[PDB]
Design a protein around this nucleic acid. Sequence first.
RNA 1: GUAACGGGGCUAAACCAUGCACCGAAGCUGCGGCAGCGACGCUUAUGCGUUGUUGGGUAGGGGAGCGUUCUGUAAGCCUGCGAAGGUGUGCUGUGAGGCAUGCUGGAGGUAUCAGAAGUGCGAAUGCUGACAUAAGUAACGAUAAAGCGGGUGAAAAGCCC
RNA 2: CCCGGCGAGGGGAGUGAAAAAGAACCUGAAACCGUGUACGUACAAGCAGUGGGAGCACGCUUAGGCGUGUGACUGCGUACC
Lengths: 150, 103, 110, 56, 117, 48, 142
Amino acid sequence: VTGSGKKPWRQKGTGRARSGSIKSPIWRSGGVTFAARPQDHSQKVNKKMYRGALKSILSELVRQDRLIVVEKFSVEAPKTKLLAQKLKDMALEDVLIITGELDENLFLAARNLHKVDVRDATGIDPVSLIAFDKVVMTADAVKQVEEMLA
Amino acid sequence: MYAVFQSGGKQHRVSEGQTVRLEKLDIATGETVEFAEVLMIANGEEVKIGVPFVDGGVIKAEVVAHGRGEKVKIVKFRRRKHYRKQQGHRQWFTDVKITGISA
Amino acid sequence: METIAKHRHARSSAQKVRLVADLIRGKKVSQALDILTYTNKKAAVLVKKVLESAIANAEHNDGADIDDLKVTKIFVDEGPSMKRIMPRAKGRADRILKRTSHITVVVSDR
Amino acid sequence: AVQQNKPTRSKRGMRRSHDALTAVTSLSVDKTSGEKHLRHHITADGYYRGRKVIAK
Amino acid sequence: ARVKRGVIARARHKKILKQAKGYYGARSRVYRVAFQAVIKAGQYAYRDRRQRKRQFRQLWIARINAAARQNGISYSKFINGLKKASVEIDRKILADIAVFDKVAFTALVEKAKAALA
Amino acid sequence: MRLNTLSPAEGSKKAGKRLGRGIGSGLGKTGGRGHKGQKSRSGGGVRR
Amino acid sequence: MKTFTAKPETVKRDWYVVDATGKTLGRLATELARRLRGKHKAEYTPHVDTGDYIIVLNADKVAVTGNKRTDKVYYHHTGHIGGIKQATFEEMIARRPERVIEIAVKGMLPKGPLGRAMFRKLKVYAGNEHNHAAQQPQVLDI
RNA sequence: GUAACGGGGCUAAACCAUGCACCGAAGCUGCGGCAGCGACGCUUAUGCGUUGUUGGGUAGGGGAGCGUUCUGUAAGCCUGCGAAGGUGUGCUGUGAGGCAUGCUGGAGGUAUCAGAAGUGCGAAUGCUGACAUAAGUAACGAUAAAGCGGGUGAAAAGCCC
RNA sequence: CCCGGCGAGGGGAGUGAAAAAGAACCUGAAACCGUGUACGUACAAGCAGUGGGAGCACGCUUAGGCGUGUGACUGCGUACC
């Protein structure tokens, strides 16, 4: 920080400043001391621990009655507005839809609402399954998730 | 009228009209206190006694508040040695009002 | 009823205004203006033009007459000070502060 | 000498209490003019006991 | 992850300074001296919870003394009298009117003097 | 909605704290470390 | 609403004239001091004192009756050369009889300020002849 | 400046001999509140009753919680039908802290519970900002000084004339 | 519209939801200097604090020394790192 060839301490023997270099963290602007650190301390997770936490939460999503497993909400057309009249008719709104079929007419529908949402089952994680009011899935996702969990 | 009595395990001097605080009782607010452990009555009066549980002589009172106190703090400290520590306590109480004194 | 006259950024310090201020403190308008003119300090002329604005704006549009008003408040606060470095013996590069005052007179019927 | 602490604002008020300059009392009239003056002294621009005063 | 600082500690300041009002000068308006004053305050206060009761007790004994001597023997024999006499509490808070009109209670003082065995 | 409902056992949490702070608390003098020499004043992270 | 407690409203002085006669300087002096705190009748309040307003009109004209004089001769700074200038015990008798009696009751009172609030209630003068007694107070023998 | 009782005072109010008393500490103790934990009873996932030593604390060890900046529900819900911010007071907790509310205020705020940290200043003859302080004290630049009428002017011994 | 010297600076009047938004204008501490009220300071003193409190305004104190804010006076009492 804009000096090394200059000390603010230059024969101290009077009552003076404690800093003694111009880049000190106790300078008004100087680069502070406990900085340039990582934003979490380590990241790996044991495979058996990761895959077994997903078993645990998955049993609980059935213990809380969030699952009833409904394949194909899709219609003739990728419009959201058609899917959402489909979801109202099945009486399950505000649900986490998991596709295992990657059908563009379902993925590109059911998304124009802040709690109506569709995702793909790819790169599963314990934090995804817990979001939104319930998780409905398709039976195509239940196959394709169960093999990442076993 | 002034009086001394023994209650709880202290002896206490008191006047008439006086609201005083004492050690906790079971008696609820709005129900009589009466003291037969009165040791003398003295208000210009010559008297014999220093005796407890005396019969004819009573101090009649009443409960006026049963409560729990506002948080006091106690600070424990010694200079020069970097020693400072703090505690709180409330203590429960009864206020009684003296509407008695007989001899 | 009540009127402020100020003079802000004025050439006094508050040590210099307070000498005049305690003589005229809560003292009625007409008597204080007699006491003030028999003080030949520089602060005492300053406060004169500012008392005269105080009394005169009250006789219209908030009130009427000037004799019946009294100086309810008389006060001084630190205005923005200009800093200069003074050249001075032996190479001394000392601070001088050029003080100003913000002077408030308040008159009301009271 | 120097000091040992920062002083009080009660002191600052105390040291200037017995210094502030005096005045005459009461709004004057004069025997020979409607002019106010400083009492027992010449009216600055009018008559006080005959004559006027002051220039420049 | 910058922190702006000085909002929790600001509340500790205002608590110290709130407790430190009715105190003189800088104690009631500046943190440093406020803190100093607050720690000395609560230590004296906690001395005086107990200590009022030691100090007062002298004043109870010194009022009782001028009565007790007027009704016979002196305070320390009277107190030993009250100790010797049966079914009777010994105490030094027995009377507030040993201050003025000290002819009352002469019979209690004669009970102790006789009982002083 | 079982999100933000995570909680593990005791001893497995930092609970938002750093030490060496306050002069009333007890942390005004050093704690978790010693005093004097090159062991605890400026450092210790250069002695083998 | 508080515990029983003492306050300055319950205690008074009145006026006392001490006709106690021919009585030795110190045997006079601790009894007057005793009453000028008040103790002989009560002391009830921590913050003020029982007190009397005390005129001495009798027994103002005898020495210390011992050796205290010669080891406490009350030196002060007042400007000298070679030594220090002093008041003598001996001066006190020649310049009105009071001063012997006076620094017997003074010295019996506390600290600075309280010992002064107490002190200002004593009067003594020339003794057995002093006009500063015309009131006719409450007569007293101690 | 007594100043070798702490001082007044005491030729017994001293000291000594016989003997008794009292006052005198959160001590010893009683009343009332309370912390954790041993022993025994009820008998338990969760606790409570009797009983009990116990609860001053640095160096130094070890354990836990708070909020500030920010993240997740927060995608929700509250808001000019009065938010943050300022201020007095009551309540509450062991403390930090938390919570209520009139005045102030005219836009912003929020748990639970987990998690990261440029994370709380009162000290470093620390660094920076506003600005206080002794003080209206001291200083009057070669002592090439000044006077006084008129005038430009609001104001003039010192300017212009 | 008022005061003043051609000035400085402010008020009233009117604007606006707000000028306790008047131009350094967001709401606004604390340092900072002064007013105004209540009560206080001239037998009167020291870490300025704690304990006890006449008194004065407000609370019928259930007048029995209390709540709240202050406070003649005084027992007791040595700042923090």
